[PDB]
Amino acid sequence: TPFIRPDMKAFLEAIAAMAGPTLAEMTLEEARASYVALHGMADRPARELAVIRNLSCPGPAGDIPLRLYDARESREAGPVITFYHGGGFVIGDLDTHHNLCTEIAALMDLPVVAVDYRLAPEHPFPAAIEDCEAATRWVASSPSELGRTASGVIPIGDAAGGNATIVVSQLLGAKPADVPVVLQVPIFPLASDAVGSASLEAFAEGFVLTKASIEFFDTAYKADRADPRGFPILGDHTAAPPTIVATASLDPIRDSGRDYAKALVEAGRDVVYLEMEGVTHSFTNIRAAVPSTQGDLERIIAAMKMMLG
Ligand SMILES: O=[N+]([O-])c1ccc(O)cc1
Ligand SMILES: O=[N+]([O-])c1ccc(O)cc1
Ligand SMILES: O=[N+]([O-])c1ccc(O)cc1
Ligand SMILES: CCCCCC(=O)O
Ligand SMILES: CCCCCC(=O)O
């Protein structure tokens, strides 16, 4: 009987009523479409912004599509947020997380560049990481196509995107971009392997992200358990940038985020650890279906402003 907010519980009851196929039982196109449909009906609508612009940058496999969000048509040099969507490195795209990106841009009053990285199974590990790193370095170089100079970058992302956040920050720590990572915001990230964790057993079914979906994602992505680009808990934390780790109390991978924040404290790094009570994985993208999660996102925003000083 873990604590669940009433609005969260109602959403979980509707998902249970829907029932229907697992990700693995669908075709890939169907699986991706169902995620579009879920966030389409569950999230608050897009904020209006001065700038919402599609562009691209070079990557190791070809061009990487990007989307720029900015509440300001013109702005001075400052930190730029570099966002990586979740979806197990298999599903999700620029549209599944579009509304959340507009919200981050609106509430932070900073530019946001979302990365349309290559997906598994067609592009297995480390394709997503390669693209997220390359796009983040490109933004950090203040290209003229972007139209706003970066004094630093802020990697942020949910779930798989929170995994990518941590990996990108480690890769740029080892080999700096043109400006530093000034803050990283992994939201319900995968840092340590969730297999064997207490949270995975406790929340394996009925809490939006399922153990079955995790296994489907594992099989598609094929990240080696010994590779720190797959499981960044294995990385060097001694120079980790300022960090905000946000988890959900009902998340099967909650303990992975607990592990990562503990590792940062162990290494003497500054970290804000926020564990949202009574909500699930995906809370950043279900802000209309579960209205209390808007407040959870706003707490992350407040922590970001504080850590940026
Ligand atoms: O990856 N996820 O966050 C998911 C995946 C499938 C789903 O039905 C809900 C959430
Ligand atoms: O999409 N996810 O959050 C995942 C995917 C795979 C995994 O092993 C753990 C978490
Ligand atoms: O979604 N993820 O973050 C993942 C997915 C697969 C994996 O092996 C490791 C992490
Ligand atoms: C929009 C998601 C596609 C990114 C490139 C890929 O399919 O692998
Ligand atoms: C093991 C999952 C139940 C959550 C109990 C805790 O907060 O540690």
Author numbering: 4 to 312
Give the exact sentences the study uses for this entry.
The family IV esterase can be characterized by the α/β-fold hydrolase group, and contains two distinct structural domains: an N-terminal CAP domain and a C-terminal catalytic domain. The catalytic reaction relies on the S-H-D/E catalytic triad located in the catalytic domain.
The catalytic triad was composed of S162, D254, and H284. We have prepared S162A, D254A and H284A variants and mutating the three residues to alanine (S162A, D254A, H284A) resulted in almost total loss of activity. The serine initiates the reaction by attacking carbonyl carbon of esters, while histidine and aspartic acid/glutamic acid facilitate the proton transfer from the serine to histidine residue. The distances among the catalytic triad in WT and mutated E53 were 2.6–2.9 Å for H284Nε2 to S162Oγ and 2.5–2.6Å for H284Nδ1 to D254Oδ2.
